[PDB]
């Protein structure tokens, strides 16, 4: 019966060369989970409306107004790149493979353990004794139908542990609810307090209330039991593991050289700009590397911080990340910044409520934008740019000295061509469910991989309520015995990938680990300390160069 | 052996379209039960005779005089509509299906847990410690023979929990016993105290004493054991899920219109009442929409509050519920009023010994009665109603100004035609055992469904008595170890039903959930609170319109 | 299918009154005049994630 | 009776893709908590020497992340199907009729 | 859309509500170089409407 | 409507953002509609006499 | 006034298959069978007295 293990531990990564350039990469990961008896006995509809910031006229973005539904269930969502592969492995993949895609994924729950804690006074004190409870049992449920709201573990940065030899706690489950929130616009110190700023009441046309009890077949398992899910397959497309340098400037045949450098110092020349073959979309009688027509448009100008408001409230309109270029425009290009914890990658030595943060910059040098160079010219395009026949990033547009065309320009056209957001090894979101809309987006910023078919299905889990000797629902007396649980998790994320070949003469950039020093690629960064503290920093994704034409 | 689950949790509802208009609806429901060691070691014959009200001359209805037999067994009777289907489901059924009937029903008992509690002083106090007892075992018995008195769980409003994510306690078992009770009639302050008012002694011709020990095969099961019952089938007839508007007034061919409305304001006319074809049961030479003969009688006048007394004592003579009409006669039409608790549907926030109550009004607009319009006329029916040739609801009948013909008139005749009592979603009684009589009633008010064949068979359950180290029956020393139990319940109530079709041009009334407001169909009514409190209010049964001719 | 606990909004026909979903809206008149007003499309709630 | 026909304004049920001009705004690149008087563009700043012409009246936020639903077809006078345009790149959908 | 902010405070009454974590010290993903997050700057899978 | 002469700059330098050509209409807006202009030689189509 | 719970409006146009027939056409229905019980064609004189 009970008293024997029901699984095996294995957190490695095997590489099976299928030849022909393709290799099947199977990533196995096992971790120990720690679940505590949920405080919320039943489903709660807590309404959070921060006014410590929303009330202020200056603060607008700090609007955490919303009404979620806290459920008594946790969640085992290991949708993180660092919770599958190993730090060293990712280096090999990015340096060799030129593309990768998800194939299958399985899960298992063995060695389920449930114990109770009681108080025991020792010498006047009160130490806690831990006694195992065999009769105790937990509850597991894998909603493969996705009947419940999809809640990415990476979107809240609360996935599983990235450290094999270290336990992890399952993040509670909760989904948003229908609530009409409204907030007026106020700059610095506008005349009078903020106009409107109130929460909303439950509507009957958008009232979405679900229950884990009626949305999945809960499988009860004790100490001697074990659970396992089927082999789910992904239909997502492969994501390139290389960056693009070619910009709209370099594409077709370069201008014919009329002069050849005599020394390694000077350079060559071109042909008469006025008298030179080529194609320009201007009625002028001259061409250049700035007016020559191109096959398409590499990258596009995106509205800088375009806060759009809706019935749910004001929000930051997402924007496809891209190279920062020499303009050093991070927030302008959409460079996403993260904030993870200790159980997610931060050094265990940095004691404090302040989590580590980093700004990820894309490697798509081709679609890079530069606000310090963007401009427009009058219809009658003339060489000499008139003082009024041009709009540079310095002309106050809209009675504002800080609001120019760049902050409100969408160059997205039928010629827009860009790459995918390079997925980060640590705290990186792998797959994601597609939106239930007639016309879903061409891609997702949260995760490179988007399940075209159905979604994997979040895995829910809750501890079985251990009632006491006395109980009475009508008396609001929910006497529960202090009980917790610790079950193991075993998953295998099989995925194939293809590797590129050396088609160049000059060695391509790689990801190496320099000696212990100021160098970012320091070994100590991923090496234990005298005490045992460790940290997981982001890795250079898409190191190899890729020609875009 | 022990230490592993023995079942699975599932509380959903699947719809299998069998085509041809019929759909098989399978309702699965699982809940956690909490049983405590019964206080009554053996069968008791407690005699309850309230005198705090019976003694008074004015109080007559408050006669709770009876002698029941309290047994040491609980009961798992989930005969409630709200303990099977989900709040949202019922809406779909009533709005689509036009009729429904019971088919099969199964039950199961897994994860049986029995633990004991002992006292343990902590820092001078006395906290209770809970230790699981493997050797402990419970007892289950399903009297499918109905050898024991049928005790509906809805008749006492003590069924199982309507909340999946919330445990529930099994209601104790007890049946009535033979006792001759007698009570005299007294109005307000009659001359002298109440004449007779005494309980009775056990008779030898009606002494009904049964024992669970000798009326069923008790199945002993421990922690590693599990029980399951066969697939019981129902022989009950399907109940229409629609209401009737047509009254005795509208049936056959309407009077021929002699005048046609020129404007949407005015109306048309009929033919000469004196000179017009038709059939009247009067010897007069004229007809009207009030004297024209009809195929049958829709509804019937029922004795208002006809308290009939018997050897058991005075009681309220049941009466088939019906529409209240414009007369607003609730207690007159038999509109049943309920009283449920928190574990049955009341808001958990409303702290207090006062339970929620509501008066259910039938939807049978056709059989509706109106005491403010009922009257009779002398045999020689004449147009001009004489002052003595008519009996309106204002003539003191029986030296009483409040006792008229309506309060004591039974219009039940061979032409009586009525519908069935619309079953309520919350605290509604589903099936019921038929009376062991030569001529049982045409129907039951308690539950729409009446098992024509044998009854399902109440499910009894009791915890195994855990004796102590010392014991001696002759010394009245029944030392029992404090022990309780918590077993899961799994049942599936399969039932088929047919759905109606849109045979009208004007949209039929439906059951919708208006936004959060004063509207009864408010969403917040079935939505959790900030704390987690919830309530289950009745639902509109038979929303679709049904033509009765 | 009913995958929620709280009843979803439906399209019903309230009694003859100021209510938009009035029955008289789709019912003939004393003369026979009739009118066809728009109906609530997509009454059921749908989760987009 | 009269030459005046009945009219009604149909409102979509896509509460998710709803816009609100009384709340839309933008902020300077250097995003700071305190919104400067010149470091923000609310729906009240005359853009183009006009007090009624703001950014909202001339802003297309259609991007590779744009996700929306289909126009709920009306029972009365509702257009069912429709022929697609004879163009190399026809629109992702039609407003006239849900079915294309 | 994704996972809602972790609740640090639980409503004692059906009137008041709960709270979140330190906006300055809270896990999450924002496309801003700032050192704080909120229900207005948190990154989303895509753009709903436009 | 397409941005007339929207010169966007990148790490490679400033360039003219391409635009799908279309009819010029009565507006006679050539550079505004994207009417592409060419420049070929003699071995490509120009008169050998010029 | 018209109620929404008992509003019964039907149309011959949507409740049966209308068969159009001209001068040279003709219609006929199937052989419907009755399940009604037979009614006695005699009277009773015997009263509760005899």
Residue numbers in the entry:
A (entry chain A), B (entry chain A): 39 to 587
C (entry chain A): 539 to 587
D (entry chain A): 389 to 488
E (entry chain A): 289 to 338
F (entry chain A): 339 to 388
G (entry chain A): 239 to 288
Copy text from the publication.
We have now determined the crystal structure at 3.8 Å resolution of the mutant N170A VP2-only capsid, and compared it with the crystal structure of the non-mutated VP2-only capsid (strain p). The N170A MVMp capsid crystallized in the rhombohedral space group R32. In the virion, the Nts have been externalized through the pores and, accordingly, electron density corresponding to the glycine tract is found inside the pores. For the N170A mutant capsid no density was observed within the pores, which indicates that the disordered VP2 Nts are not constitutively externalized. The structures of N170A and wt capsids are very similar but not identical. The root mean square deviation (RMSD) was 0.58 Å for equivalent Cα atoms in both structures (1.08 Å for all atoms in the 549 VP2 residues superimposed). In the ring of five N170/D171 residues located near the base of the β-cylinder that surrounds each capsid pore, the N170 amide group can form a hydrogen-bond with the carboxylic group of D171 of the neighboring VP2 subunit. This interprotein interaction cannot occur in the N170A capsid structure. In addition, removal of the amide groups of the five N170 residues generated five cavities around the pore walls. However, the free aperture of the pore at the tightest constriction formed by the ring of L172 residues immediately below the N170/D171 ring remained nearly unchanged, with a diameter of 7.9 Å in the N170A capsid compared to 8.2 Å in the wt capsid. The results reveal that the capsid-stiffening, cavity-creating N170A mutation neither modifies the diameter of the pore nor induces any dramatic conformational change around the pores; instead, it generates subtle rearrangements that propagate through the whole capsid, resulting in a more compact, less flexible structure.
We have been using the parvovirus minute virus of mice (MVM) as a model for studies on virus biomechanics. The virion 41 is built from a self-assembled T = 1 icosahedral capsid, 43 into which the single-stranded (ss) DNA viral genome is later packaged. The capsid is made of 60 protein subunits (VPs) with identical sequence and fold, except for their N-terminal segments (Nts). Pores (channels) at the capsid 5-fold symmetry (S5) axes are involved in DNA encapsidation, uncoating, and biologically relevant translocation of VP2 and VP1 Nts in the virion.
